[PDB]
Amino acid sequence: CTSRFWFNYRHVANTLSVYRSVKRLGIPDSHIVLMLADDMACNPRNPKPATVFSHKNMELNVYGDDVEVDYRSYEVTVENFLRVLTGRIPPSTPRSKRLLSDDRSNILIYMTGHGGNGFLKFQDSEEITNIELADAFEQMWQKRRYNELLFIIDTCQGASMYERFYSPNIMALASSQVGEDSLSHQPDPAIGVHLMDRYTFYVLEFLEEINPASQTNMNDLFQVCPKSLCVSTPGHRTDLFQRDPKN
Amino acid sequence: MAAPLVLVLVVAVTVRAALFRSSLAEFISERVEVVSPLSSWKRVVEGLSLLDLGVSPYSGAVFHETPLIIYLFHFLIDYAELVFMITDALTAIALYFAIQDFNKVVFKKQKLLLELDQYAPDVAELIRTPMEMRYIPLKVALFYLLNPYTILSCVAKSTCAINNTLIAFFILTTIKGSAFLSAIFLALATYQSLYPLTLFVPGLLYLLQRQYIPVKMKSKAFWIFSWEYAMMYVGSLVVIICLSFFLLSSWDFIPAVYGFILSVPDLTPNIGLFWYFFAEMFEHFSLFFVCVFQINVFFYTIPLAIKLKEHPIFFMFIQIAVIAIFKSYPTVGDVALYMAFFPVWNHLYRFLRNIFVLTCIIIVCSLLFPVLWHLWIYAGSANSNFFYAITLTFNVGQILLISDYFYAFLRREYYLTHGL
Amino acid sequence: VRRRALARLVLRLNAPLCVLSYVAGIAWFLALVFPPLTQRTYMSENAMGSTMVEEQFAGGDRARAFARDFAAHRKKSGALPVAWLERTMRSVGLEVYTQSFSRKLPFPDETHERYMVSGTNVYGILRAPRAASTESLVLTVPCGSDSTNSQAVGLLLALAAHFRGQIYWAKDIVFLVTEHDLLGTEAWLEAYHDVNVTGMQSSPLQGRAGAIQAAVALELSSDVVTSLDVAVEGLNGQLPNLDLLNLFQTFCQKGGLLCTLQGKLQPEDWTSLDGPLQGLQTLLLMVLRQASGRPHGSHGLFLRYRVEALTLRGINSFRQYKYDLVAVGKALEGMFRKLNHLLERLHQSFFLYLLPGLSRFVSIGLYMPAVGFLLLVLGLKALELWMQLHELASLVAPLLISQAMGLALYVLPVLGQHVATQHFPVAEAEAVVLTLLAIYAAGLALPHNTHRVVSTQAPDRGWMALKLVALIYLALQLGCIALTNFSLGFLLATTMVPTAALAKPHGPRTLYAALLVLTSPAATLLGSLFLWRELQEAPLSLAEGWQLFLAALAQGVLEHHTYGALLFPLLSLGLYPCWLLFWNVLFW
Amino acid sequence: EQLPVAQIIHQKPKLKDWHPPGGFILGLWALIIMVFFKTY
Amino acid sequence: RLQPHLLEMLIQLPANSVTKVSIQFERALLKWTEYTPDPNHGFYVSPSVLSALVPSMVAAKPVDWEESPLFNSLFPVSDGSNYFVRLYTEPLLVNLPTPDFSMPYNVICLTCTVVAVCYGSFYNLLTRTFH
Amino acid sequence: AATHLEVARGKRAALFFAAVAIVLGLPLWWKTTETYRASLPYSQISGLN
Amino acid sequence: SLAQLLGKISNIVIKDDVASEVYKAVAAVQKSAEELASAHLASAFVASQEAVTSSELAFFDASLLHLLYFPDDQKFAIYIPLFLPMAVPILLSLVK
Ligand SMILES: CCCCCCOC[C@H](COP(=O)(O)Oc1c(O)c(O)c(O)c(O)c1OC(=O)CCCCCC)OC(=O)CCCCC
Ligand SMILES: *[C@@H]1O[C@H](CO)[C@@H](O[C@@H]2O[C@H](CO)[C@@H](O[C@@H]3O[C@H](CO)[C@@H](O)[C@H](O)[C@@H]3O)[C@H](O)[C@H]2NC(C)=O)[C@H](O)[C@H]1NC(C)=O
Ligand SMILES: [Ca+2]
């Protein structure tokens, strides 16, 4: 989550919804490198401390009682992110703050925040571009640090963040296409700021209905958000995956 | 030793004492244009207090004065206002007598050149004349004392006043021809502010011009005197450096003073070109600009020497101006030292291209510095860009003023040779 | 060849270029009420523009009960009920502190009959539970020595009762009830930052709330209210960040409140017949109020401490539709709840604006030419005076005296009040104002004693140098003033610049004297008082106009001494000597 | 001991007013006189 | 950038009284790449530590850390008539002057342009011969 | 005479500007801006493929 | 991978530690390959371990991230303001 300032509560909620689904489906905390550029979970402005909500009904706290943030506040930088992906972190970094993936590792990477054309703003200050992201993914593939990689981005014009990928096994999702930038705004009266980005909200709803022993496939998640529901057109990308998404 | 210079001195000390005892003294001392990290009374007192606590004054980022300053204000900590009055009076006296002797030498050279008639016939109101040079030393002392820059520097109790006194005594001793005292005062000034080293080139030249030693390659006497003066200067510098070591028994003043002057780590706003440039600078690619901006101060010394070989006092004035404008952490009292030399070159007030607009720009910038400083430090109405723009305009005005004076001097020399 | 060509083409147009520049500046100022320059106001800061507030303040009846109790105890306790305020603030769960302050006014002020001001400020601190008490917001009611603002104290206590009990406070809320209208606010603000800017004595504060971010100065002396009157103009012409006023306007729109700036309304400025007129009228009112430089309300004292402050004055007119505490209480709660979202000191929007109608504004880069052309008039006069001077001791004599006169006008009126009262049967404040006016006229009627020395015959050249110096000085300080506060610089350059440009002894030399005297800073203040009273549809005759001029001089001196208002020193030390220099230029 | 008041006062050498060493004063004062004799 | 100020003082608090220890500081201007992503929020001065042996109303007994409840064995009591307390003051929000983060490239051009106008003026005077 | 002397001085100053701006101007750019690269075996590493 | 990374982007400061590790890794790879073709499995395994440690210390070094260095294209745009003063000596050495 590359966003601060408590009015970007939607981005923290996106990240924590993906985190809740992933941790419910099996991935341990040690294998999740969670980054929240601001808590917005129990900062003083929160009307409900220690909770992050997905819906106005306030019945599903994506910031549950079992959550670990490996990188938070000023630690969540484009530098630190690329360090985690490429493995070039400082040597004192612990296990929990690094991606110790191998050739047999499936990696899910979910990026959320303000994002323009082929670039993602990190805490309103710095920038990660699709060129740098593709280069980092290639560097990961050179060392065989992932078996298959699923990239999901939930920013504006997010289909261009995965437009410069060349590493062999990556399939990518995106909330919006190259052009659409209209950013939704419907602040909850109870929680002052916006709740979600409406794309990961339906991804969360899609992922809430499956169990760990579920046979749902990527083809059932390639149409989780239709044009009727999220104003933007969520575009995927399978030009690299060898395996058929339906399997 | 003058009838009206004493009156000038009493008026200056009266003004300075009134300001010291007024309620504006604290405001002036906290002014950032008149006070730098190198010339702050608050920082001198802080270093003394650190010594009282037993911690070294240079084991921190707040004290950057020299051990001679430490020693001097250890004893004169209570009489500081009187000491600063005395040092500005000494600067005025040194400038007065230096300019008096320099005018006498200039008239002597003009007479010895009119005798052999190296001037064109169309030169009548273009030769320096004794009635117009009678009050030039008095006007020099008057510009040095009764201008707001020096008054503010004194009231703020900045050590830039001490630096000015050292440089003025260097000028006086060089003009009187005392090579040894010239070297001592040049070494003291270089030890204090690190940018009178360039002034080594003019003084020597004038010294040679006073000894009638030709300045040329195939001249043994020129090399002998140059080596003698250079050895006196470097030996004085190294002796002062070793003595300053012995004051604290440690070489900590060396980094904290000279590397602080050269590397610029403070970024405190000034009237100079360094603070904002190095605050908003890219991390890599920044050492190159430190290097070039420090080379800037020393860059023109050799070309101005080989263009102003026969005019080492105008060359000294231009060098002092270049130091004052391009300098890590310059106070406005450094501007006063070269502005006091204007009456020496007021006979060029017929070739000055644009003096009115430049004086207006400098005055407006001087009176806008506190105003915009208030508007982005105490009032949130403005930002650092306002102060940066005023610093840019002030420094451009200084450059164009100095270039106008230099152009006028060269044009007057050309008209002395060729008829107008 | 080229230099003479340019010189002849510019002196051929001395008078027409100067008058064209002056009229251009006036026209640019008049054009600051039109859409291209006054586009619209907006919330630049997303920290509170991208959020919403669902107000739940429903304690208006408690506010009324608190107002009744406060009025009763304030009738019993003559000045301010301190024990009752402490009990009530500790009942709503605040940390209650009092500050005793006292001040020696220079003279009895002839307005509140107060000479030895002494009172207590009572403030309570809402301690942000989840925060570490590092930032704070101030809700202040400036109680005076009369029956007003008893409802505002009740509303403040009712809001404190509501805010206490909420976990969503990132900043402490300070509920401050000052003793006097502005002296108490100044005392509290000085002791809070522990500075002594105005030399006022007080007791040490037993409790602070951290760096103050924003401040609200609710004045409300009626139960129901017809319209809500915001005021954003601070001491020395300073203004709050525009986002605070945008926040107020958006919470007026959301709650249906009929909110007004300086008592004026515009549904939409685009009416093409009167919208420009109402915009011009309200912008003129803002300019006259900002040039005044006094702290209209307690919000004006916070701006010196880099605190964005705003006064809301509930006014109960003859409009039959009324809003109770709930509308105003909900507006205040929403404002504070949305300032709580700031999480960063207001650094966006604008700090230097000049806004016509609470929804329109002009940036500094947009209204700067209005005074820039007026300064260009002086610049052209100086340039052509210099080039006529080119094609001394006689300047030292005026300058010094002029500056001396300024220093005479700054210190003597207030310290010589005792001898003026022992001489003439006038009040101490009248003694101060009489001394000020007498010294003004003494500087006026003194061109001859200084002319006891004659070192030039039919001079007409040292004359030019004196006028050149005066023009440069006037342009410089008018530009500086316009940078600090535009309105004062503009108002001074509309009157002094045209007369300063034309001051030669070659003309009538009697019409010129009348022009300079009628555009002197004192005459500028008198005309500004007349225009300000006219702009409120309350015309004033010469008698009570002169009485108001007396009151304005006395208030200028007093406000300078009590809040550090930079208008008495500015007129008396920097502008009066320059205008006297022009006077000497006239009578050479 | 959480606050050993007696021990922590004596752990620091006594705060004495600083003065320049006799070596510097003698060294500086000797050479100030020395320059007074080359010129005089 | 390498070490903070540390100040440790043993102040004898006299009686029922308020001791006002104050120290003046001057705010520094930092590099543009030295402020937090929220530069206008400010910087935090760490809460100051206040270690004292406050006198006790009634003298305590020497009690072993096993029989005693867990809240009575945090600090190793030494005297008995005085109990050790370690207070922490509030963190302080101090704002620093800030450079304009949006103008790092224009500043280089403008300052180098001032250097360049000086260089050009001195070039066109030290090399150009009058004619 | 004097004109020749001033022309020679101006040419010397221009020479000094050129000489400095090259000999110390370009090595400064080189030494204080270049990314420092140590010697890596680029033939052995390729041979290990 | 390291060679390709350093050849692709020419703004990475590779320092003496990285070069030392690369040299150690290459030497150890050659030694282990020449010892595997012998009755020297133990020495070959130790050399392979040394080679892996050196090569992964060189590859995963904090200083190889291309964000620590100013972009090369913009390095020739932050110098034009110094081209303007430096364009005068180079041109006036040729015109005269
Ligand atoms: C040498 C003289 C002038 C030097 C530069 C002037 O311009 C700099 C300042 C702007 O003051 P500011 O900080 O209010 O405005 C801004 C922001 O607040 C902000 O947040 C931004 O992101 C901005 O970009 C921004 O404007 C800018 O970047 C400025 C762009 C101009 C560059 C020219 C090549 O001018 C003046 O005020 C002084 C008036 C000058 C004369 C006394
Ligand atoms: C800000 O500065 C002013 C002075 O410029 C301070 O006012 C001074 O306050 C003290 C009280 O602490 C006054 O002393 C008192 O005098 C009376 C009568 O002489 C005496 O009976 C009292 O025991 C006490 O000593 C002093 O007169 C007064 N000065 C002036 C000029 O009025 C003010 O206290 C400062 N602000 C703060 C917050 O301290
Ligand atoms: Ca983890």
DSSP string, A78-137: HHHHHHHHHT---TT--STTS----TT-EEEEEEES-EETTEEEETTTEEEEHHHHHHHH
Angstrom CA distances, C524 to C496, C515, C521, E106, F43, stand at: 8, 11, 5, 42, 86
Mind giving me the DSSP string for A222-235?
TTSS-TTTSSS---
DSSP secondary structure code for residue A73 in this structure: G
Give CA–CA dist A226/A228, Å, rounded. 5
User: Amino acid letter at A49?
Assistant: P
Ligand nearest to the CA of C100: 2
* Deposited resolution, Å: 3.1
CA atoms within 13 A on the CB side of E111: 29
Provide the CA G44 distance to its chain's centre, in angstroms: 27
Q: Are residues G65 and A78, on separate chains, in Cβ contact within 8 Å?
A: no
Question: In terms of Cα–Cα distance, which of E107, E99, E90, E91 is closest to E40?
Answer: E99
Q: How many CB atoms lie within 10 A of CB G84?
A: 16
User: Amino acid letter at C500?
Assistant: A
Distance B23 CA to ligand 2 centre (A): 17
Q: How many CB atoms lie within 10 A of CB B21?
A: 10
- The tokens describing C560, both together, are 């300078």
Run of H or E residues at B166? helix B160-176
Please tell me whether residue C205 adopts helix, strand or coil conformation: coil
- The tokens describing C528, both together, are 């500004």
C-beta separation of B169 from B199 below 8 A: no
C-beta separation of C107 from C432 below 8 A: yes
Contacts of A37 in chain E (CB under 8 A): 37
- The tokens describing B373, both together, are 């400083």
**C316 Cβ contact list (under 8 Å, min separation 6):** C222, C224, C225, C226, C322
Sheet of A106-112: strand order equals: A106-112, A148-154, A170-174
Give CA–CA dist B84/B19, Å, rounded. 13
User: Amino acid letter at A164?
Assistant: R
Q: How far is C55 from chain A (nearest CA, A)?
A: 9
Give CA–CA dist E31/C509, Å, rounded. 59
C359 lines ligand 2 (CB under 6 A): no
CA atoms within 13 A on the CB side of B27: 11
Question: In terms of Cα–Cα distance, which of C400, C229, C209, C376 is closest to C310?
Answer: C229
Mutual orientation of helices C150-163 and C60-76 as an angle, nearest 10°? 130
To the question of whether residue F37 is assigned a binding role by annotation, the answer is: no
Burial of E90 (0-12, 13-18, 19+ CB in 10 A): middle
Q: Domains (ranges, CATH) in chain A?
A: 1-247 (3.40.50.1460)
Give CA–CA dist B90/A246, Å, rounded. 93
All chains having 3 or more CB pairs closer than 8 angstroms to chain A: C, E, G
Give CA–CA dist C152/C225, Å, rounded. 12
Chains E and D touch (3+ CB pairs under 8 A): yes
C-beta separation of B168 from B89 below 8 A: no
Q: How far is E10 from chain F (nearest CA, A)?
A: 49
Give CA–CA dist B59/B55, Å, rounded. 7
Check the CA dihedral B342-B347-B351-B355 and report its sign.
positive
Give CA–CA dist C81/A104, Å, rounded. 76
User: Amino acid letter at B375?
Assistant: L
Ligand nearest to the CA of A98: 3
Angstrom CA distances, B412 to B345, B415, E59, stand at: 11, 5, 94
Angstrom CA distances, B164 to B53, B91, B149, stand at: 31, 7, 12
Q: Are residues G3 and F35, on separate chains, in Cβ contact within 8 Å?
A: no
> Where do runs of H (alpha helix) occur along D1-40?
5-10, 22-39
- Beta-bridge mates of residue A76: none
Q: How many CB atoms lie within 10 A of CB G30?
A: 15
C-beta separation of C191 from C202 below 8 A: yes
Long-range contacts of B298-306 (CB under 8 A, 24+ apart): B298/B197, B298/B198, B299/F20, B300/E122, B300/E126, B301/B198, B301/B201, B302/B201, B302/F16, B303/E122, B303/E126, B303/F13, B303/F16, B303/F17, B304/E122, B304/E126, B305/B201, B305/B202, B305/B205, B306/F9, B306/F12, B306/F13, B306/F16
E113 lines ligand 1 (CB under 6 A): no
Best of C186, C193, C201, C415 for a ligand 2 pocket test (most atoms within 8 Å of beta carbon) = C201
C-beta separation of A160 from A226 below 8 A: no
DSSP secondary structure code for residue C267 in this structure: S
C400 lies within 8 A of chain B by CB: no
C-beta separation of C121 from C101 below 8 A: yes
To the question of whether residue B385 is assigned a binding role by annotation, the answer is: yes
CA atoms within 13 A on the CB side of C575: 28
Longest alpha-carbon distance in chain G? 76
Distance B154 CA to ligand 3 centre (A): 62
- The tokens describing B329, both together, are 């952490």
Q: A107 — phi, psi (to 5°)?
A: -120, 130
- Beta-bridge mates of residue E88: E49
Contacts of C130 in chain E (CB under 8 A): none
User: Which residue minimizes the CA distance to atom 5 of ligand 2?
Assistant: C199
Q: How far is G56 from chain E (nearest CA, A)?
A: 31
Question: In terms of Cα–Cα distance, which of B361, C374, G65 is closest to A79?
Answer: G65
C197 lines ligand 2 (CB under 6 A): no
Which atom of ligand 1 sits closest to the CA of residue B383? Answer: 13
Give CA–CA dist B307/F10, Å, rounded. 7
Q: Are residues F40 and G96, on separate chains, in Cβ contact within 8 Å?
A: no
Residue E89, sorted as left (phi over 0), alpha (psi -120 to 50) or beta, turns out to be: beta
> Where do runs of H (alpha helix) occur along A87-155?
130-142
Give CA–CA dist E95/C372, Å, rounded. 34
R_g of chain D computed on alpha carbons: 21
Residue C404, sorted as left (phi over 0), alpha (psi -120 to 50) or beta, turns out to be: alpha
Mutation choice for C interface testing from B351, B360, B381, B384 by most C CBs within 10 A: B381
- The tokens describing C274, both together, are 């009167």
- The tokens describing B233, both together, are 């200067």
Question: In terms of Cα–Cα distance, which of A57, A56, A10 is closest to A37?
Answer: A10
Residue of chain B nearest C382, judged by CA positions: B356
User: Amino acid letter at B291?
Assistant: C
Contacts of E78 in chain D (CB under 8 A): 1-2
Ligand nearest to the CA of C195: 2
Angle at B231 between CA B227 and CA B237, to 5 degrees: 150
For chain E, the helix, strand and coil percentages under 3-state DSSP, each to the nearest 5: 25, 15, 60
Which residue in the set G59, G62, G68 is minimally distant from A90, CB to CB? G62
Contacts of C351 in chain B (CB under 8 A): 379-382
> Where do runs of H (alpha helix) occur along B117-159?
136-145, 148-155
Run of H or E residues at G84? helix G80-95
Contacts of B367 in chain C (CB under 8 A): 476-477, 480
Which atom of ligand 1 sits closest to the CA of residue E102? Answer: 22
C-beta separation of A97 from A31 below 8 A: no
Angstrom CA distances, B36 to B158, B371, C343, stand at: 8, 18, 34
Chains F and C touch (3+ CB pairs under 8 A): no
DSSP secondary structure code for residue C106 in this structure: S
Mutation choice for G interface testing from A86, A92, A100 by most G CBs within 10 A: A86
Please tell me whether residue A65 adopts helix, strand or coil conformation: coil
D12 lies within 8 A of chain E by CB: no
F8 lies within 8 A of chain B by CB: no
Provide the CA C272 distance to its chain's centre, in angstroms: 31
C-beta separation of C126 from C164 below 8 A: yes
Residue of chain A nearest C171, judged by CA positions: A44
Which residue in the set E33, E99, E110 is minimally distant from B392, CB to CB? E110
Chains A and F touch (3+ CB pairs under 8 A): no
